Amino acid sequence: QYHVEKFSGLRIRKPRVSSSEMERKMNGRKLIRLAQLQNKIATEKLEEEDWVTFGVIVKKITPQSSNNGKTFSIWRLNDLKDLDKYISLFLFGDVHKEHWKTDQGTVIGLLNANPMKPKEGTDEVCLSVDNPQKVLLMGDAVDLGTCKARKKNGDPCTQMVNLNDCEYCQYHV
Numbered sequence: 772q773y774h775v776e777k778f779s780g781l782r783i784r785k786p787r788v789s790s791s792e793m794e795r796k797m798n799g800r801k802l803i804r805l806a807q808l809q810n811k812i813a814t815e816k817l818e819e820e821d822w823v824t825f826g827v828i829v830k831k832i833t834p835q836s837s838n839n840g841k842t843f844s845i846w847r848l849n850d851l852k853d854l855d856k857y858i859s860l861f862l863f864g865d866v867h868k869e870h871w872k873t874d875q876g877t878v879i880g881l882l883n884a885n886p887m888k889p890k891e892g893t894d895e896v897c898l899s900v901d902n903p904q905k906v907l908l909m910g911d912a913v914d915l916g917t918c919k920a921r922k923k924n925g926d927p928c929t930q931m932v933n934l935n936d937c938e939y940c941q942y943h944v
């Protein structure tokens with residue numbers, strides 16, 4: 772719950788991974804910030820990377836299918852650094868079975884995920900993983916927060932914020 776984690780730049784309540792063991796897993800890999808994913812997939816040169824990325828589970832969807840099996844879930848991720856950039860992580864079969872009860876607000880490491888086929892109508896980056904071990908639970912995002920201001924009207928502002936970097940959102944300074 773105090774000072775920052777080297778790789779994600781977030782401070783984590785009750786960390787789950789040795790400092791050493793992080794450098795170990797991180798070794799020889801490329802750190803790609805979540806915001807850089809869209810372009811690397813578009814320019815079609817993400818595959819050739821042995822890459823790692825970091826997100827906070829901002830939201831969990833556990834929608835409908837049972838199509839032939841078979842339940843799955845979706846996580847909305849944000850790095851609390853580019854508060855505008857989000858990606859969606861699809862968990863299927865093994866991976867769902869294994870991680871789907873993870874608490875929202877958990878910071879995760881995501882390694883060498885697979886881009887989903889792009890769906891008409893979206894601006895959206897979606898990825899899945901062929902293996903439970905591609906998702907590294909690192910602990911709680913102690914700074915996941917909301918703009919402290921009030922919507923110049925009534926109601927409190929609802930904009931997402933990094934409580935350790937800034938307490939107000941972009942639109943209130």
Ligand SMILES: [Zn+2]
Pocket residue numbers: 918919920928929930939940941942943
């Ligand atoms: Zn605000």
